[PDB]
Chains A and B, each alone.
Chain A
Amino acid sequence: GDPRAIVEYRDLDAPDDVDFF
């Protein structure tokens, strides 16, 4: 029995992400 609740990424607002470096 996996003793850890599933994560909730509901509002994981990922707008625009690039790697400046």
Chain B
Amino acid sequence: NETEDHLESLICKVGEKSACSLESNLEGLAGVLEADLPNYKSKILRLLCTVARLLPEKLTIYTTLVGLLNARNYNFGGEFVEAMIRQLKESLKANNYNEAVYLVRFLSDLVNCHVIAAPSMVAMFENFVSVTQEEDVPQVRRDWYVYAFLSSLPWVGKELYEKKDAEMDRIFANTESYLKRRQKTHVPMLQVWTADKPHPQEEYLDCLWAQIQKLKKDRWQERHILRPYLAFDSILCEALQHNLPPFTPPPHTEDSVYPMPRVIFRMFDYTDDPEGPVMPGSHSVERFVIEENLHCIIKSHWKERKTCAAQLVSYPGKNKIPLNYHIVEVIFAELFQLPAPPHIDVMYTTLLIELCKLQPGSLPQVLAQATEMLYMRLDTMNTTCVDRFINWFSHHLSNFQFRWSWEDWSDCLSQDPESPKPKFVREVLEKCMRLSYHQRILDIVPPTFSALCPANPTCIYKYGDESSNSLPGHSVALCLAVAFKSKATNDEIFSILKDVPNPSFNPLKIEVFVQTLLHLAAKSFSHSFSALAKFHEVFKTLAESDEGKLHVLRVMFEVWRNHPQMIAVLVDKMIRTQIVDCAAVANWIFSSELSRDFTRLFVWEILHSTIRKMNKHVLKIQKELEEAKEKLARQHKRRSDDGVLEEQIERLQEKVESAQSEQKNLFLVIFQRFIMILTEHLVRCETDGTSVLTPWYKNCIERLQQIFLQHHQIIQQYMVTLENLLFTAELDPHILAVFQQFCALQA
């Protein structure tokens, strides 16, 4: 085992900063490798493949190394390329296309090292492009394949064009013939900003082809990619040439899944750094390679934030560039990209904090500049990206003792209170309060911003002493209050509630009970949990009907209407205790009581949390059934090799079926609600002849888009019913556009 880990340490150690020159390390390691080749053939093969698949940010470095070994051995090289091609085949069969891209890139840079003859690579690329000519195949395939080809170009384009420019030109003509007839319906659902200025958010393929065209016009003269093999001239030039076998991409299969299309996130510009190095242009291939390298570095060290920040700060390049802006832009692109970021958002905020720690002299200014820039473009940002921005900002400021120059944003005061900028400011203040106390928010926020600060989080007990005795149930409320101070049992409370004047459901009964209960347990979250759990059988008996569940939700909202966090946590606990099912918490968000608070964040956070709990419950029951089935099968085969369990399996099968049915019903109810509300709004606006684009409509439509983006993985199963019942042709085109975008997202 010492041999294997010694080899791994040797191979990995190349690339890191060291006193000796890079060429010396490569030559020395190559010498050690040839010194140990006859006994460690397969070991070094495995290590090289693994490093070709898990270290794209050193893709050049190892490629150079692989040439030196080839210069020392021909059989080694041939077996290495055979291995790599078989690994690529496996990767394409595993539906893991990212490593497929990395492999292709490696092969192309290996072609640069005089290992594989150019014509074979030309044939491989021709097959890739010809994949676009396949019939009745998803466009996300054709897409990925063209993307792999074009992304491989920035590394071996000079060589292939200078060797086979004729076939290259034919291939480019085919690529244009394909790209001119692509479908762009998915772009609006994926753009962070819908505005075309000052930085259009163009699709990744279009931008990549623009970079390729610019590079071609520049005679394939890049200025950023590192090419260590240039110094290794003689050695490599006296190396034999291998030929890759004819490659045929695996045929399309129903179970195959391809990466969904994405949109490049562009928000900076060279004019933003009048002092630093000239930032690469938005259509320069250097900016694509830089973004790709940063993405790989973040994906290779996403576990240790310290190491990730250290790697990002020390990113090497052929020519000096404004690496601070690139890092900030790529991090924000990961955070904001739809449907979901590569990793958990808190990872990105902590990574930014660590990066500021490493480079306090320059990075904080860049972060502040990006913050202001995002604020100034809030008028069109997607609501999902807005939510991510609000969360990030709040947490990130909380870290630095809520110290922002709010006066610089006084503009929100002048414009409409419901406009995106003032709404964002109010939500940020509310979240900041959620991490602090109301007095803190007041003290920090300028006086002129006081109209935006969230309301004080105080309980509103309708049955207070000042409250008039005329309202029914005041005596019952006092009796319940005394009982609560007297540690009364459930039967006592039942007796107390029996003498309530009904105007199997008594809305006044539930109102008085819930009101009193909540009021008494209104000094901390934990007391509220204890009261709900202890007296959860009174809720369960009184809220048998879904109407009762809705009434309990409404009363709970009335009690805590100056504190959204309490709403969220209390409905989370009620749902967990099966006090109210998720459907009831779905029909309560679309109710007329919350119309004034429909666009607030807490409502959508509550909705998302309920969906998440429902999904986790379904997955947990499915996993339990899977474990039971596996145990039954193992016992059966072991006994054979020598009915109660079958009954339990059947029961769990029926339970999982019912859980899936309730999940489906939840999603269907949510979408039906959205459809009804948006249809009514559009009809009213059309009759009034007013502008259809208002902040409320944008918020609602982008929330529907957010639901689709978050839970496409499950809605893929409901696609049929969704298309048959909710999103039909008769529906208004505005609403149907979201469903069409969702369908095109993976087709």
User: Within 8 Å by CB, do A and B touch in the complex?
Assistant: yes
Chain A residues packing against B (C-beta within 8 Å)? 2-4, 7-9, 11-15, 17, 19-21
Q: Find out whether the CB atom of B576 lies under 8 angstroms from the CB atom of A19.
A: yes
Contact of B487 among A11, A12, A20 (CB under 8 A): A11
Q: Say yes or no for B523: interface residue by CB 8 A criterion.
A: yes
Tell me how far the C-beta of A9 lies from the nearest C-beta in chain B, rounded to whole angstroms. Answer: 6
| Nearest chain B residue, comparing its CB with the CB of A19 | B576
Residue of A nearest to B580 (CB): A21
* B interface with A by C-beta (< 8 Å): 437, 439, 487, 523-524, 526-527, 529-530, 533-534, 575-578, 581, 617
Which residues on the A side are within 8 Å of B526 (C-beta)?
9, 12
Most buried by B among A8, A19, A21: A21
- CB contacts (< 8 Å) of A19 on chain B: these are 576-577
A20–B526 Cα distance when bound, in Å, is 19
Q: Which 5 A-B pairs have the closest CB atoms?
A: A21-B578, A17-B533, A7-B524, A19-B576, A20-B578
Inside 8 A of B437's CB, which chain A residues have their CB? 2-4
Q: Secondary structure at chain B's binding surface: helix, strand, loop or mixed?
A: helix
Binding site secondary structure of chain A = loop
Asked if A8 and B523 make an inter-chain contact with CB atoms under 8 angstroms apart, the answer reads yes
* Number of cross-chain contacts by CB at 8 Å: 38
Check A3/B439 contact, CB under 8 A, given A11-B487, A19-B576, A21-B617.
Answer: yes
Q: A14-B533, A15-B534 are in contact. Are A9 and B617 (CB under 8 A)?
A: no
Question: Nearest CB to that of B582 among chain A residues?
Answer: A21
Kindly provide the distance from the CB of A12 to the nearest chain B CB, expressed in whole angstroms: 5
**A12–B526 CA distance with the chains assembled, in angstroms:** 8
A7-B523, A21-B581 known, 16 other contacts, Cβ within 8 Å = A2-B437, A3-B437, A4-B437, A4-B439, A7-B527, A9-B526, A12-B526, A13-B487, A14-B530, A14-B534, A17-B529, A17-B533, A19-B576, A20-B578, A21-B578, A21-B617
List the B side residues contacting A2 at CB < 8 Å: 437
Q: In the assembled complex, which residues on chain B have CB atoms less than 8 Å from the CB atom of A8?
A: 523
A3 to B307, CA, bound (A): 40
B534 cross-chain contacts in A, Cβ below 8 A: 13-15
23 contacts between A and B (CB under 8 A): A2-B437, A3-B437, A4-B437, A7-B527, A8-B523, A9-B524, A11-B487, A12-B526, A12-B527, A12-B530, A13-B487, A13-B530, A14-B530, A14-B533, A14-B534, A17-B529, A17-B577, A19-B577, A20-B577, A21-B575, A21-B576, A21-B578, A21-B581
Chain B residue numbers with a CB within 8 Å of A7 are 523-524, 527
Q: Give the chain B neighbours of A11 by CB distance below 8 A.
A: 487
Q: Please report the C-alpha to C-alpha distance between residue A20 and residue B577 in the assembled complex, in whole angstroms.
A: 6
Q: Distance (Å) between the CB of A18 and the closest chain B CB?
A: 9
Shortest CB-to-CB span from B574 to chain A, Å, is 10
Residues in A whose Cβ lies below 8 Å from that of B533: 14-15, 17
Give the complex CA separation of A20 and B617 in angstroms: 11
Bound-state CA distance A11–B521 (Å) is 11
* Cα-based distance from A3 to B443 in the complex (angstroms): 12
Q: Which A residue's beta carbon lies closest to that of B540?
A: A20
Which B residues touch A3, using CB under 8 A? Answer: 437, 439
User: Which residues of the partner chain B approach A21 to less than 8 Å between Cβ atoms?
Assistant: 575-578, 581, 617
Contacts of B487 in A (CB 8 A): 11, 13
In Å, the complex CA distance between A14 and B532 comes to: 10
- A10 CB to closest chain B CB (Å) equals 10
Please name all residues of chain B whose beta carbon is closer than 8 Å to the beta carbon of A14 when the two chains form the complex: 529-530, 533-534
Min CB–CB distance B536 → chain A (angstroms): 8
Q: Distance in Å from the Cβ of B249 to the closest Cβ of chain A?
A: 47
Contact residues in A for B581 (Cβ distance below 8 Å): 21
Q: Which residues of the other chain, A, contact B529 by a CB distance below 8 angstroms?
A: 14, 17
Q: Please give me the residue from chain B that is nearest to A16 by CB atom.
A: B533
